[PDB]
């Protein structure tokens, strides 16, 4: 039986991202579209700052930017939380602590607006260094790949996820961003609570060679693991 959630999700899906966010009172807007093709675990998304130079490094809001696109093999489906809390949505709450400086805070509303997946994200940034690795923007435009672990939280009807972002500083050195999250179903339906497992990351970023604002173009694959 496939349910609804999961039905949602069978084709590629147009996608639209709004941030507002304010980084130790640097404030910006970045909108994004793309689309998602969950069969394939497969995002393309390509993000533009509204409001000029963004204020911190593209690499550092990559994790910002709907994990209801991640492929889960047919033998975890019981086991995916996003798509079962669809189409009334989801939202994702996450702090960020930048090791040896600030930190973000993160709330995220993933919802259906009729054939759009969209995403409205606020992000405060807080407690940053003014010339350290994130607003002197020494991190480098690349990304690694990682895995995202994710448990249930039974008690939030939702789950909790935890997982570290090493990003590259232009030295040859690494920035970590310890990541805490939880997600919590909008509406009061049923969702799936999973067992125990792994979202696998893959992600390249990349730049429009016509576009001239401030710009990200955003590749990724996530596929769910570690149950068989
Ligand atoms: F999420």
């Given at each position: 039986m496939?349910?609804?959630?999961?039905?949602?999700?069978?084709?590629?899906?147009?996608?639209?991202?709004?941030?507002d966010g304010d980084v130790n009172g640097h404030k910006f807007s970045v909108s994004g579209?793309?689309?998602?093709?969950?069969?394939?675990?497969?995002?393309?998304?390509?993000?533009?700052?509204?409001?000029?130079?963004?204020?911190?490094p593209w690499p550092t809001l990559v994790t910002t930017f709907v994990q209801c696109f991640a492929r889960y093999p047919d033998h975890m489906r019981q086991h995916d939380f996003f798509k079962s809390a669809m189409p009334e949505g989801?939202?994702?709450?996450?702090?960020?602590?930048?090791?040896?400086?600030?930190?973000?805070?993160?709330?995220?509303?993933?919802?259906?607006?009729?054939?759009?997946?969209?995403?409205?994200?606020?992000?405060?940034?807080?407690?940053?260094?003014?010339?350290?690795?994130i607003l002197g923007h020494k991190l480098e435009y690349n990304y690694n790949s990682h895995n995202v672990y994710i448990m249930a939280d039974k008690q939030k009807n939702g789950i909790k996820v935890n997982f570290k972002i090493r990003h590259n500083i232009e030295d040859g050195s690494v920035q970590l961003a310890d990541h805490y999250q939880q997600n919590t179903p909008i509406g009061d339906g049923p969702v799936?609570?999973?067992?125990?497992?792994?979202?696998?990351?893959?992600?390249?970023?990349?730049?429009?060679?016509?576009?001239?604002?401030?710009?990200?173009?955003?590749?990724?694959?996530?596929?769910?693991?570690?149950?068989?």
């Amino acid at each position: 039986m496939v349910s609804k959630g999961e039905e949602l999700f069978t084709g590629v899906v147009p996608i639209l991202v709004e941030l507002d966010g304010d980084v130790n009172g640097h404030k910006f807007s970045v909108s994004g579209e793309g689309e998602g093709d969950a069969t394939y675990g497969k995002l393309t998304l390509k993000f533009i700052c509204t409001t000029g130079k963004l204020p911190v490094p593209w690499p550092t809001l990559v994790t910002t930017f709907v994990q209801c696109f991640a492929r889960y093999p047919d033998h975890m489906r019981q086991h995916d939380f996003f798509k079962s809390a669809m189409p009334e949505g989801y939202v994702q709450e996450r702090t960020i602590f930048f090791k040896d400086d600030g930190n973000y805070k993160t709330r995220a509303e993933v919802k259906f607006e009729g054939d759009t997946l969209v995403n409205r994200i606020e992000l405060k940034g807080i407690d940053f260094k003014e010339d350290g690795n994130i607003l002197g923007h020494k991190l480098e435009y690349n990304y690694n790949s990682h895995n995202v672990y994710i448990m249930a939280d039974k008690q939030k009807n939702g789950i909790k996820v935890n997982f570290k972002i090493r990003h590259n500083i232009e030295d040859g050195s690494v920035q970590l961003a310890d990541h805490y999250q939880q997600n919590t179903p909008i509406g009061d339906g049923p969702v799936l609570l999973p067992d125990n497992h792994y979202l696998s990351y893959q992600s390249a970023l990349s730049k429009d060679p016509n576009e001239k604002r401030d710009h990200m173009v955003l590749l990724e694959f996530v596929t769910a693991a570690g149950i068989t």
